């Protein structure tokens, strides 16, 4: 009794679909800067696995320029600040012990 896709990826909070190249959280689309958009794109695809800043930015740019966390930080803060859900849902996107950013312990997919 739920209208949800299968090919695309959708979590218990946000949803990402390459067909519409957009993200939907809480039933409504979420606007995010190019980078911020790419950040989550990989963040979800690599759920469960700890995504490091250096390994994250690599997806945003893809250049040989390492140590470019500068963009990552800004992106993260922009991701949570925009996905700071409280009434509808918590902040699934929690931060790990200075090891990056992973999903909440109550969010996962086999």
Give me the residue spans of the domains in the chain: 1-110
What is the C-alpha separation between 39 and 69, in angstroms, rounded?
Answer: 12
59 neighbors 67 (Cβ within 8 angstroms): no
- Phi-psi category of residue 47: left, alpha or beta, with phi > 0 → left and psi -120 to 50 → alpha: beta
> Looking at the domain 1-110, which fold is it?
Arc Repressor Mutant, subunit A (1.10.10)
* φ/ψ of residue 14, rounded to 5: -105, 160
Structure determination method: NMR
3-class SS of residue 38: helix
Kind and range of the H or E element at 73?
helix 69-82
Neighbours of 46 (CB within 10 A): 14
CA proximity to 19, closest of 8, 11, 28: 8
Count of all residues that appear for the chain in the document: 110
94 neighbors 103 (Cβ within 8 angstroms): yes
* Residues in a beta bridge with 28: 25
């Amino acid at each position: 009794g739920t209208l949800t896709p299968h090919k695309t990826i959708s979590f218990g909070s946000l949803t990402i679909d390459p067909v519409n190249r957009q993200v939907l959280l809480g039933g409504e689309n979420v606007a995010l800067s190019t980078a911020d958009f790419d950040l989550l794109w990989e963040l979800a695809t690599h759920a469960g696995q700890i995504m490091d800043r250096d390994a994250l930015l690599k997806n945003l740019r893809g250049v040989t320029y390492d140590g470019m966390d500068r963009s990552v930080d800004v992106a993260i803060s922009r991701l949570r600040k925009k996905l700071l859900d409280n009434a509808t849902e918590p902040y699934r996107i929690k931060t790990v012990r200075n090891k990056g950013y992973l999903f909440a312990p109550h969010a996962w997919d086999n």
